[PDB]
Amino acid sequence: ECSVIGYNAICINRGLHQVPELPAHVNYVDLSLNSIAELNETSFSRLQDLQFLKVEQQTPGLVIRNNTFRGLSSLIILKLDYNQFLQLETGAFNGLANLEVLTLTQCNLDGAVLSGNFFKPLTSLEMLVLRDNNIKKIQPASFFLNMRRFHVLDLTFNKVKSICEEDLLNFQGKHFTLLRLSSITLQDMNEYWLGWEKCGNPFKNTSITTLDLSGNGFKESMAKRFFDAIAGTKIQSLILSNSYNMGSSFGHTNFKDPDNFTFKGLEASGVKTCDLSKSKIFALLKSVFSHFTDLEQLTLAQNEINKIDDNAFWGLTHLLKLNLSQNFLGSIDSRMFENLDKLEVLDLSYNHIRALGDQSFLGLPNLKELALDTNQLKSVPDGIFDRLTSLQKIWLHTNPWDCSCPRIDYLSRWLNKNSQKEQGSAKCSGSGKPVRSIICP
Amino acid sequence: LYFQGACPSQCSCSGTTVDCSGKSLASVPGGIPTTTQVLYLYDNQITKLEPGVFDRLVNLQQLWLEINQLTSLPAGVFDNLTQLSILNMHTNQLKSIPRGAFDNLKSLTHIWLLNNPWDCACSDILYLSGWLGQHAGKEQGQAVCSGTNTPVRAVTEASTSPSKCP
């Protein structure tokens, strides 16, 4: 009943109660959405070698017996997600010394799956996905020290109380390429918690390429204490999107906006990209990003930013890309974008901008891409764009442009001479003709 | 989310080719199938390679690493790629190549090294310059010394010094 096409055997939702007899040369097998109640050593007796095995979402209670995978010396990826009340015997993964990827998402597993000996045989393991289980504390046993190629751990949607130095002791010395700790709440780590000093640095002697901490609230006081706690950790990309508690927002809230102290612990982290999108930041305070001295990309998209104080971008001598889309900016002036001499891409789309100051883009001699579409601009000052000599792409459409003469004379003439750069074409309100085509008498 | 079949979700796979190019990647994806013969990793933001990243990819015939931000290479990173014929590393941030890095690449026929800031004042350059002198026909374009334009192939031991190695 399985569909066999070359080396792939697709057995999704076939009402199977055991591994069927199939040709012995296949290297990809998908057994998802069946009613297999137990896998044992006889389950994969004939399907040797094998590189990719999927058994997701069986009927509740799948049991994986000792030595189930012994002999599968070619197996690289083993996916077992969405098996409710998954029962693993302690030798369930015996023989998988070459496995690199294991996914055990939504299996009602708890912290003992990391502290017990379940994963001790997986000496070549590189990527472990444990999303959406019941792991309340992250306490890897010591054998993780010898998993020399372990570099990806995903614990998203586990109700983790807190992460501390002693918890992660057996991750020390490691370089993670991706450590995804998204939407785990960290409920205990509030400003009043007595455990902060004992907590130490959870990421001690550990470097991380992409640190994903999205969806965790991250009240300003918490971000400050957390990054102070992990001070010195080398992080290339920091993801803090969906921090619903970070900004103080439009309108009376109880939370504070970040300031020049919030991210101080990351001064020596070498962060290259930072994602703070989909939060509730209302004002950019002075030197709030002054500790990101290596940062190359910064997105603040989809916040509630209404105000940008002076020197908000202080210290960003290397910043190349700034995304400010979907906020509530009211007017742009020359002061707002100081300290961004090297900026090349600026996204100001989907805002509420009604005015551009005379010298708004003065300090951006290297600017290549400027998006200003979907705002409320009716006119621009003469010469506002004449010094952007490196400019390659500009968005000005979906604005209620006032195309009266001679007010529109500069913009209409400028857009025509530079017609190859305009993205989406800016249109006059009312007549709808391209601004680039208007020639004032 | 992580895998579309056996292909890493960030990449596109066809036959034995795995295309991870132009996907704003900061690191090499995990779970690349061991049958991969062609691996595209060009035009990303990869700043380092972890030791052994390619150790399992014994079938690789082409490795495209150009247009990244690599600042050094780990020792032994190519040692298991004995079928490798194409190795493209132009437009990166490399200052030297670790001693013996290409020793095992007996099937190599095309190598790109240009547009890197090779640090020829520093004696670490000497493995590469000697290697280029013995395998001149393989290079596409000309790797050149930073700040002097002098091809790497022409480096003499007299011109180098251990003390000029920051």
Ligand SMILES: *[C@@H]1O[C@H](CO)[C@@H](O)[C@H](O)[C@H]1NC(C)=O
């Ligand atoms: C499986 O292997 C472990 C190894 O310690 C052993 O203790 C256990 O009795 C075996 N059988 C079952 C059913 O767990």
Ligand SMILES: *[C@@H]1O[C@H](CO)[C@@H](O)[C@H](O)[C@H]1NC(C)=O
């Ligand atoms: C800015 O962010 C929005 C929201 O994710 C995205 O659609 C857009 O492509 C981004 N633009 C740039 C230039 O980063």
